[PDB]
Design a protein around this nucleic acid. Structure first.
Ligand SMILES: [Cl-]
Ligand SMILES: [Cl-]
Ligand SMILES: [Cl-]
Ligand SMILES: [Mg+2]
Ligand SMILES: [Mg+2]
Ligand SMILES: [Rb+]
Ligand SMILES: [Rb+]
Ligand SMILES: [Rb+]
Ligand SMILES: [Rb+]
Ligand SMILES: [Rb+]
Length: 136
RNA sequence: ACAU
DNA sequence: CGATGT
């Protein structure tokens, strides 16, 4: 219904899917970029969306912030809730980096606690999430 | 079908 | 048009 403006919004950007993956987090109210991941040579949209949420959790925990996180990814929200990224991407030498980061993100979720609400950004009602890359 |  | 996911 109502956007919670006091929040962090995250999104993935890619060149190809699977392809080059990056992600960023922004203050929902101002658009200020708060973190950006260096591009990863091969990943999927959903792996990137998952990493972006987990990085948001870690970012907010380190800063003692109780703000919620918005993501537009039904898939990534579920994977974080499950603490398990159920990606179909082949595990091979060219995908080793993304899978390392996904494995490390799951490991962090399994060893840390958080109360951060992870909320669905309602694109159909509100437009593109504020962390979007503007490539579509 | 819905979400990317 | 192709892809990733529930
Ligand atoms: Cl990461
Ligand atoms: Cl909330
Ligand atoms: Cl959801
Ligand atoms: Mg997205
Ligand atoms: Mg986007
Ligand atoms: Rb803390
Ligand atoms: Rb986009
Ligand atoms: Rb977009
Ligand atoms: Rb979207
Ligand atoms: Rb589909």
């Amino acid at each position: 219904e109502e956007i919670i403006w006091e929040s962090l919004s995250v999104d993935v950007g890619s060149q190809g899917n699977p392809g080059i993956v990056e992600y960023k987090g922004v203050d929902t109210k101002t658009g200020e970029v708060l973190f950006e991941r260096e591009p990863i040579p091969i990943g999927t949209n959903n792996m990137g969306e998952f990493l972006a949420i987990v990085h948001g959790l870690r970012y907010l925990k380190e800063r003692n912030s109780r703000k919620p996180i918005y993501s537009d990814s039904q898939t990534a929200i579920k994977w974080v809730k499950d603490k398990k990224a159920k990606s179909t991407l082949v595990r091979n030498e060219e995908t080793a980096l993304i899978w390392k980061l996904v494995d490390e993100a799951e490991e962090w979720l399994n060893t840390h606690t958080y109360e951060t609400p992870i909320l669905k950004w309602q694109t159909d009602k509100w437009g593109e999430i504020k962390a979007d890359y503007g490539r579509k």
